[PDB]
Amino acid sequence: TLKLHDLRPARGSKIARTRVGRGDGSKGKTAGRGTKGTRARKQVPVTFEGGQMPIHMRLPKLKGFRNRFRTEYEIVNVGDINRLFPQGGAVGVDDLVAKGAVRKNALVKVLGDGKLTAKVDVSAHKFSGSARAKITAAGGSATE
Amino acid sequence: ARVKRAVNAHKKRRSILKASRGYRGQRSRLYRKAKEQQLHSLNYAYRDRRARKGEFRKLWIARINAAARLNDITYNRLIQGLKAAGVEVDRKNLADIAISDPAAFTALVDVARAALPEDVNAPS
Amino acid sequence: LKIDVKTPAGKVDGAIELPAELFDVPANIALMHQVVTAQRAAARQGTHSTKTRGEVSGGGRKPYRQKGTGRARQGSTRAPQFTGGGVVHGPKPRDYSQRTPKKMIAAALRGALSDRARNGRIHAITELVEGQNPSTKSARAFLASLTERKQVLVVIGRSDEAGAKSVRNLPGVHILAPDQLNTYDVLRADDVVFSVEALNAYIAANT
Amino acid sequence: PKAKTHSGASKRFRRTGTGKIVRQKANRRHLLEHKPSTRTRRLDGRTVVAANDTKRVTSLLN
RNA sequence: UAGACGGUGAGAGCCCGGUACGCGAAAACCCGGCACCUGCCUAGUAUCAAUUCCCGAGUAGCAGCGGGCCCGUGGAAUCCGCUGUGAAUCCGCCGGGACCACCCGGUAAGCCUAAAUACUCCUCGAUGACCGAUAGCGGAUUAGUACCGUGAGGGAAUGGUGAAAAGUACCCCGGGAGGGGAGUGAAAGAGUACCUGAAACCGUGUGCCUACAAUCCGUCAGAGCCUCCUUUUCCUCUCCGGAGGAGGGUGGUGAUGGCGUGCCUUUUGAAGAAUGAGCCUGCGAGUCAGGGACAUGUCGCAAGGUUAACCCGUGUGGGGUAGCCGCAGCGAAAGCGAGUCUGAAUAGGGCGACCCACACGCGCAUACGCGCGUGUGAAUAGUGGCGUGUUCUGGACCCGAA
RNA sequence: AUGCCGUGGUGUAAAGCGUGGCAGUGAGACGGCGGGGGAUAAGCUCCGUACGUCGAAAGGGAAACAGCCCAGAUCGCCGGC
RNA sequence: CGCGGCACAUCCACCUUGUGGUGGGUGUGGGUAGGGGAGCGUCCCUCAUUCAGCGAAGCCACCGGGUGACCGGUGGUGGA
Ligand SMILES: [Mg+2]
Ligand SMILES: [Mg+2]
Ligand SMILES: [Mg+2]
Ligand SMILES: [Mg+2]
Ligand SMILES: [Mg+2]
Ligand SMILES: [Mg+2]
Ligand SMILES: [Mg+2]
Ligand SMILES: [Mg+2]
Ligand SMILES: [Mg+2]
Ligand SMILES: [Mg+2]
Ligand SMILES: [Mg+2]
Ligand SMILES: [Mg+2]
Ligand SMILES: [Mg+2]
Ligand SMILES: [Mg+2]
Ligand SMILES: [Mg+2]
Ligand SMILES: [Mg+2]
Ligand SMILES: [Mg+2]
Ligand SMILES: [Mg+2]
Ligand SMILES: [Mg+2]
Ligand SMILES: [Mg+2]
Ligand SMILES: [Mg+2]
Ligand SMILES: [Mg+2]
Ligand SMILES: [Mg+2]
Ligand SMILES: [Mg+2]
Ligand SMILES: [Mg+2]
Ligand SMILES: [Mg+2]
Ligand SMILES: [Mg+2]
Ligand SMILES: [Mg+2]
Ligand SMILES: [Mg+2]
Ligand SMILES: [Mg+2]
Ligand SMILES: [Mg+2]
Ligand SMILES: [Mg+2]
Ligand SMILES: [Mg+2]
Ligand SMILES: [Mg+2]
Ligand SMILES: [Mg+2]
Ligand SMILES: [Mg+2]
Ligand SMILES: [Mg+2]
Ligand SMILES: [Mg+2]
Ligand SMILES: [Mg+2]
Ligand SMILES: [Mg+2]
Ligand SMILES: [Mg+2]
Ligand SMILES: [Mg+2]
Ligand SMILES: [Mg+2]
Ligand SMILES: [Mg+2]
Ligand SMILES: [Mg+2]
Ligand SMILES: [Mg+2]
Ligand SMILES: [Mg+2]
Ligand SMILES: [Mg+2]
Ligand SMILES: [Mg+2]
Ligand SMILES: [Mg+2]
Ligand SMILES: [Mg+2]
Ligand SMILES: [Mg+2]
Ligand SMILES: [Mg+2]
Ligand SMILES: [Mg+2]
Ligand SMILES: [Mg+2]
Ligand SMILES: [Mg+2]
Ligand SMILES: [Mg+2]
Ligand SMILES: [Mg+2]
Ligand SMILES: [Mg+2]
Ligand SMILES: [Mg+2]
Ligand SMILES: [Mg+2]
Ligand SMILES: [Mg+2]
Ligand SMILES: [Mg+2]
Ligand SMILES: [Mg+2]
Ligand SMILES: [Mg+2]
């Protein structure tokens, strides 16, 4: 019978705690600092390179603008329609969420990477150019 | 959990003060001045466990040299004479024969003298 | 895998089948330890506190002049190097609770009950006392005909109030509902006694 | 609370698909008459941050 | 249905107060039910017409200077304040980030609205991997007292006999204070200076060394005394024991010989005539919060992992899919997508994707392979807990100014 | 003359290189050699040097003596060179 | 250099032929700032087990022990 005095964690899960500043036999008086300067009593910021112009102000900005109205399509490849649906049938935006190939409540989009051999009848948003070539060659149909 | 320190802290204070019984002044009475003295005593001991191997050897040579010159040989030629004769008696015992049994030290001189080169200043 | 249900002052009145995916799981020791630790840490009340140098009463002014005295310069009378000063890095009120996932809690529980079912330590009863008024002397005698050990877990339903009252003040008997089974209370007890209405509720809630 | 990302570094760096950090190049915003076009073409595009700045740029971008 | 907690001459469910569980309210107050009482309604409704009147004024709009919004006057809308100008009542008017046109939403300048939320001087009931007299409140004790300051204000120190006071009757030295003998008690090795009674510091007794020697005060070599134990042949008082002596061995001392420049911080370098410390006991410095950030150890599940607020439970347990990270990238972006941006390019490059160690058929080639079907079933991978190292925001390792 | 870059042999465990976690240091001193500033003065000042020791190195020698000569303390020994 | 103890690294043979021990060569082990690894001691809580008015803790003395922080035994005082 397992009791509570038989429970012990895995080897290496729980290491001890080096308490700094407790004697010369361990990390001693200066507690891993050694200095007499700013590093001895404070924290030097990352954004400060000594007084020269830093890396976040020498360099120019990245060009352009973010689009405020960018629609984003979640992506399923037709090489995963073959692997997840190996007997064909109707493929929809709702059947791809349950099979784990795409997220909820987003606009799906079938791309064309991989090998498709099943006769699938897929109904997505905004098919690719090479997706329509690989689905109709297997006898299927690609409807919006 | 607030921890009092005195049961832990007295363990090393009773070890220094028992190691310091026999020190005059404040060095048997006070923990701060008797820990300083234990740092020097255990260095002087380490320094002198290694130095007393060359103090007793410095005492044995002074007695081998003292008992060589009663048998009109020097220490300089007694040790040359005992390597050519193949006697590997160390200097602890070669200086203990000279006190305990002085008639067996004259015989070791006669072996060291006879097994020595005839002209000691000649090129070998 | 098969458990015979016992009656008070009587004999067997059936058999309850323990399913294998719920009572025959290999015991993961390094998983039961994280779930026990995450339960006892959620029982720390955490109410412990001290005062820092800005909450100890007084200590606003600089106490005397800095130069010319030959004393050290001291800043405030409630500094932590003083007697009566604030505590530096002292305890504050904490919430020592952890966030163990659901699939690790419910797997350490099944591992704890599997090690009971594998050693012949799971029992099943129809009730504890046959009547409706409680009686400890009859419920103590019936838990001694089952087991002879010191720590007994009794898992009975929430609606059976007449049997919960019979085993409240016994030394070494812990009482909980079927929907309150946890790893610490199962591993503490040498023996685990399910009511037959309570054993069919733990199984049915886990298919 | 919650860590704030440096607003000047999030406008001057970005990440690729495998975790490299890219940036643009200086000496190209103005004074462009005397510069031969083999120099303003060397300053075109984007480069990977050097291996000696890649630690500090990471702690700004996170 | 009582094994919660405490008290009693030491660990009490069965000795006491109580606990589980039940009963109990003259009167006063609060809550609720019903009467009395108080108030409202008992004339409009439906259809048609589209001419008229009304739909909150020094208000909205506009302009000047400001305030606040992610928005620091900017192309600057929405909202609010002062000055000037100053409308219209539905074909009216405001808003949808300058503005115009169409369209969609809405009726400003009058007022009142419970619940969800914030807090605890104070009242009851509970609790603590919180403190236990330098701690916990400043305050267990005359405590905001004594004391300091003209004032506003500052602001302490002090707990423990014993189970029971049984608190030492009586005699003795003494002016008393205090003690000795008796007596109490299990114990005065508990005596109102009181449980345990450490260290600094101060005496008394005793063993050894010390008054011709220049000493970081110790260390190694080392004689002589002193003490206490025992092989060893006597004393055979002899059964003994030590009576003594020779020998060995513990503990104390240390004549005398060598070596030896205190601890700490700071420094190129200190025994330093650089800095800090009179001594002892007590206290006094990398802590904690966050689904934070980067990296790693380990555990769970795995193309998935995980919930947050909240709801339900005597709990640490059971529900909860909103969200987050992974799932395909490139580009300033529209976009296109195993590719994509630059370009006139089927040029080259940037970023990204892409497995022959193995048999096959196979256009071919000395071979290895270039290519393609299928396994020999190429080896992948993320996420969420918990440890640790760093780091960010906060007082952030502690102490210290003018 | 040395020093430097390349290459082929031979020798050498704790050499090197890439990529991440955590650093500390960024006031040096003296002696050898080669030079500038100084009066070829300085325990002067500023350089160079797969040069040294100190820093951070105790032990032995130089009477004493961070830096000079010999030599790198794992611990024990009343052993030898 | 000789003779014994300890530790680290690597090599070479075994055992569950690395989750690790045993055995044998060779090499190594001064050290500040600092990095990494492995531990002693004190206090609180849970689980198990065992001592305690036939004397616990705390204290003092003595005799021992371990590679270090330190630990054990006997006795004295003490009273949970
Ligand atoms: Mg120190
Ligand atoms: Mg520094
Ligand atoms: Mg400095
Ligand atoms: Mg300092
Ligand atoms: Mg400047
Ligand atoms: Mg002495
Ligand atoms: Mg020697
Ligand atoms: Mg204040
Ligand atoms: Mg101040
Ligand atoms: Mg306080
Ligand atoms: Mg939960
Ligand atoms: Mg431009
Ligand atoms: Mg040009
Ligand atoms: Mg009790
Ligand atoms: Mg009683
Ligand atoms: Mg403004
Ligand atoms: Mg608009
Ligand atoms: Mg209105
Ligand atoms: Mg209106
Ligand atoms: Mg209102
Ligand atoms: Mg309200
Ligand atoms: Mg309340
Ligand atoms: Mg209260
Ligand atoms: Mg107090
Ligand atoms: Mg006390
Ligand atoms: Mg007054
Ligand atoms: Mg008297
Ligand atoms: Mg008396
Ligand atoms: Mg008596
Ligand atoms: Mg007593
Ligand atoms: Mg007193
Ligand atoms: Mg007393
Ligand atoms: Mg004399
Ligand atoms: Mg002299
Ligand atoms: Mg001397
Ligand atoms: Mg100086
Ligand atoms: Mg001094
Ligand atoms: Mg002096
Ligand atoms: Mg100074
Ligand atoms: Mg001083
Ligand atoms: Mg992008
Ligand atoms: Mg171009
Ligand atoms: Mg390309
Ligand atoms: Mg993982
Ligand atoms: Mg590195
Ligand atoms: Mg500098
Ligand atoms: Mg410099
Ligand atoms: Mg220099
Ligand atoms: Mg010169
Ligand atoms: Mg100089
Ligand atoms: Mg230094
Ligand atoms: Mg030296
Ligand atoms: Mg060196
Ligand atoms: Mg020297
Ligand atoms: Mg000398
Ligand atoms: Mg010689
Ligand atoms: Mg060495
Ligand atoms: Mg070392
Ligand atoms: Mg160090
Ligand atoms: Mg007694
Ligand atoms: Mg006794
Ligand atoms: Mg205790
Ligand atoms: Mg002891
Ligand atoms: Mg004892
Ligand atoms: Mg005792």
Curated annotation (Swiss-Prot), chain A:
UniProt keyword annotation of Repeat present: no
> In this UniProt entry, which cysteines form S-S bonds?
none
Q: One Gene Ontology cellular component annotation? A: cytosolic large ribosomal subunit
Tell me the domain of life.
Bacteria
**Which key words tag this protein in UniProt?**
Ribonucleoprotein, Ribosomal protein, RNA-binding, rRNA-binding
User: Which intervals carry biased composition (Basic and acidic residues)?
Assistant: 1-9
Q: Name one GO biological process term.
A: translation
The record's section on PROSITE patterns has: RIBOSOMAL_L15
The molecular function terms of the Gene Ontology recorded here are:
rRNA binding; structural constituent of ribosome
Q: Where is this region: Disordered?
A: 1-40
Q: How does it assemble?
A: Part of the 50S ribosomal subunit.
PANTHER family xref list: 50S RIBOSOMAL PROTEIN L15 (PTHR12934), LARGE RIBOSOMAL SUBUNIT PROTEIN UL15M (PTHR12934:SF11)
Similarity section: Belongs to the universal ribosomal protein uL15 family.
Q: Which NCBIfam families match?
A: rplO_bact
In UniProt terms, what function does this protein have? Binds to the 23S rRNA.
Please give the name of this protein: Large ribosomal subunit protein uL15
Swiss-Prot record, chain B:
GO annotation, biological process: ribosomal large subunit assembly; translation
Query: What are the protein's GO molecular function terms?
Result: rRNA binding; structural constituent of ribosome
Q: Could you tell me which InterPro entries the record lists for this protein? A: Ribosomal_bL20, RIBOSOMAL_L20_CS, Ribosomal_protein_bL20_C
Gene3D superfamilies under this entry? 6.10.160.10, Ribosomal protein L20 (1.10.1900.20)
Q: Which UniProt keywords apply?
A: Ribonucleoprotein, Ribosomal protein, RNA-binding, rRNA-binding
Q: Which GO terms describe its cellular component?
A: cytosolic large ribosomal subunit; plasma membrane
Q: Which PROSITE patterns match?
A: RIBOSOMAL_L20
Would the keyword RNA-binding be found if you checked this record's keyword annotation?
yes
Protein task:
Binds directly to 23S ribosomal RNA and is necessary for the in vitro assembly process of the 50S ribosomal subunit. It is not involved in the protein synthesizing functions of that subunit.
Q: Which family does it belong to?
A: Belongs to the bacterial ribosomal protein bL20 family.
PANTHER family, per the entry: 39S RIBOSOMAL PROTEIN L20
Q: What is this protein called?
A: Large ribosomal subunit protein bL20
Question: Which organism does this sequence originate in?
Answer: Mycobacterium tuberculosis (strain ATCC 25618 / H37Rv)
Q: Which gene encodes it?
A: rplT
UniProtKB/Swiss-Prot annotation, chain C:
Among the GO molecular function terms of this UniProt record, one is: rRNA binding
Spell out the subunit comment: Part of the 50S ribosomal subunit.
**Where are the stretches annotated Disordered?**
41-98
Pfam families for this protein? Ribosomal_L4
Any GO CC annotation of this UniProt entry: cytosol
Give the record's GO biological process terms: translation
What name does the UniProt record give this protein? Large ribosomal subunit protein uL4
Q: Which gene encodes it?
A: rplD
Q: Which domain of life is it from?
A: Bacteria
Cited function:
One of the primary rRNA binding proteins, this protein initially binds near the 5'-end of the 23S rRNA. It is important during the early stages of 50S assembly. It makes multiple contacts with different domains of the 23S rRNA in the assembled 50S subunit and ribosome. Forms part of the polypeptide exit tunnel.
Say which family it is in. Answer: Belongs to the universal ribosomal protein uL4 family.
Keywords of this entry: Ribonucleoprotein, Ribosomal protein, RNA-binding, rRNA-binding
Q: Which residues form the signal peptide?
A: none
This protein's record includes keyword Chloroplast: no
InterPro entries, alphabetized = Ribosomal_uL4 (IPR002136), Ribosomal_uL4-like (IPR013005), Ribosomal_uL4_dom_sf (IPR023574)
From Swiss-Prot, chain D:
- Check the UniProt entry and state the signal peptide residues, or none: none
Q: Does the keyword Ribosomal protein apply?
A: yes
Region labeled Disordered — which residues? 1-21
Entry keyword set: Ribonucleoprotein, Ribosomal protein
Q: Which GO terms describe its biological process?
A: translation
Q: Which residues form a coiled coil?
A: none
- Superkingdom, taxonomy of origin: Bacteria
Which GO molecular function entries does the Swiss-Prot or TrEMBL record give? structural constituent of ribosome
Gene3D superfamilies reported for this sequence: 4.10.410.60
Query: Which InterPro entries did the record assign?
Result: Ribosomal_bL35, Ribosomal_bL35-like, Ribosomal_bL35_CS, Ribosomal_bL35_sf
| Family the entry assigns | Belongs to the bacterial ribosomal protein bL35 family.
**NCBIfam families named among the record's database cross-references:** rpmI_bact
Please give the HAMAP family that the UniProt record associates with this protein: Ribosomal_bL35
Identify this protein by name. Answer: Large ribosomal subunit protein bL35
- In which organism is this protein found? Mycobacterium tuberculosis (strain ATCC 25618 / H37Rv)
